[PDB]
Amino acid sequence: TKTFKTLDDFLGTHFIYTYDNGWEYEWYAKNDHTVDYRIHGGMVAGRWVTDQKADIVMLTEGIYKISWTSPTGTDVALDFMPNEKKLHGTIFFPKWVEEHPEITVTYQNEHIDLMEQSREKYATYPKLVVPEFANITYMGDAGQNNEDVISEAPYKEMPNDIRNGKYFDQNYHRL
Amino acid sequence: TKTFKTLDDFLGTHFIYTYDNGWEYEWYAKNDHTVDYRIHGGMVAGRWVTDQKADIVMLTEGIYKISWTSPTGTDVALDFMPNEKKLHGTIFFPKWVEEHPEITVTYQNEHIDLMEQSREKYATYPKLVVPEFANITYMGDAGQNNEDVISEAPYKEMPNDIRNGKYFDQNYHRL
Ligand SMILES: [Ba+2]
Ligand SMILES: [Cl-]
Ligand code: NA
Ligand code: NA
Numbered sequence: 001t002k003t004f005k006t007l008d009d010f011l012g013t014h015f016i017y018t019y020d021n022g023w024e025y026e027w028y029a030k031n032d033h034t035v036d037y038r039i040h041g042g043m044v045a046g047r048w049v050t051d052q053k054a055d056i057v058m059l060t061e062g063i064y065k066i067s068w069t070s071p072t073g074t075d076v077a078l079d080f081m082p083n084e085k086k087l088h089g090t091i092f093f094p095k096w097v098e099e100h101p102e103i104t105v106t107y108q109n110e111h112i113d114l115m116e117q118s119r120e121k122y123a124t125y126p127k128l129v130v131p132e133f134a135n136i137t138y139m140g141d142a143g144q145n146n147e148d149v150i151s152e153a154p155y156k157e158m159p160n161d162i163r164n165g166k167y168f169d170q171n172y173h174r175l
Numbered sequence: 176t177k178t179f180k181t182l183d184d185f186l187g188t189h190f191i192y193t194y195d196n197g198w199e200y201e202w203y204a205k206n207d208h209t210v211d212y213r214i215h216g217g218m219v220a221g222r223w224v225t226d227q228k229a230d231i232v233m234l235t236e237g238i239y240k241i242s243w244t245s246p247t248g249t250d251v252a253l254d255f256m257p258n259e260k261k262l263h264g265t266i267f268f269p270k271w272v273e274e275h276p277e278i279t280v281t282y283q284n285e286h287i288d289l290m291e292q293s294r295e296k297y298a299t300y301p302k303l304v305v306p307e308f309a310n311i312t313y314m315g316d317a318g319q320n321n322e323d324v325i326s327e328a329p330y331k332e333m334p335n336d337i338r339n340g341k342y343f344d345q346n347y348h349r350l
């Protein structure tokens with residue numbers, strides 16, 4: 001077990017977690033203004049995102065808050081409490097994402113224009129707000145600016161492969 | 176200052192705080208699902224809200240997170256660290272609020288239809304995201320469900336009057 005104490009301790013960390021609503025997420029603090037993530041279970045499962053710009057601060061010792069807005073229109077605020085293996089996230093979904101979640105299920109980086117066209121075309125209100133705690137199931141020190149971390153679409157067995165030490169090498173690159 | 180340990184300690188607390196951009200806000204935890212607030216500084220100074228529904232939780236001992244979405248379309252995630260006199264809030268404004276702030280500068284509770292109509296008529300994107308720490312300059316033990324706390328429009332010297340103990344009586348009523 002390592003104690004998370006500084007912003008530097010947190011950056012470069014690679015998380016897997018399950019929300020209290022059953023939803024399984026994966027998230028990486030690439031650097032101090034960039035996040036990658038990959039969704040395994042729930043409404044928008046299969047979706048993954050690299051190079052998302054984000055405000056990342058340490059609130060107080062060992063507690064980390066991350067904010068970003070998405071090309072879909074989705075707003076996010078994550079609070080990591082890694083010394084307790086816990087997280088809290090609020091996701092503010094536009095109405096169209098709840099109605100048509102599969103539109104967002106893709107490699108978003110290749111379909112930015114689709115997301116921007118969708119968010120203006122389809123309904124935004126009422127919003128779906130998902131305020132939930134999560135248990136952290138995996139913590140890896142990937143280092144900052146590591147391109148191998150979230151570099152492919154999710155598959156059924158992927159979270160287990162990572163948790164079991166059968167996905168990355170000693171240097172945290174994929175085999 | 177009292178030590179905040181539990182969710183109970185937090186509920187019924189009346190705050191005034193200045194964000195790092197200089198924006199003075201005031202905010203009250205009326206109950207476990209309801210917030211009242213009043214704005215004294217910045218883009219939407221003069222705006223006040225009551226009976227806004229919100230998700231309110233204790234993240235970890237003495238740290239609190241509040242999530243709500245507004246009739247304006249605005250998304251808010253607030254993190255309180257009252258034992259440090261520090262807070263962090265992320266506000267996600269629709270483009271239209273940045274472009275027409277003065278529509279929202281009113282008692283919202285009397286102009287709900289105008290807010291809902293404007294969020295549909297004007298632009299949602301790009302969002303203006305305001306990630307900032309605040310310094311807490313006032314903490315009042317207002318008790319839960321006190322309708323007097325935020326019951327009038329802000330005036331210039333109002334935060335001073337509250338800080339200076341000239342606004343409420345001994346039972347935390349305006350008079
Ligand atoms: Ba698709
Ligand atoms: Cl509101
Ligand atoms: Na995104
Ligand atoms: Na990556």
Ligand code: NA
Nearest residue numbers: 191192193312
């Ligand atoms: Na203040």
Ligand code: NA
Nearest residue numbers: 216217218219
């Ligand atoms: Na303001």
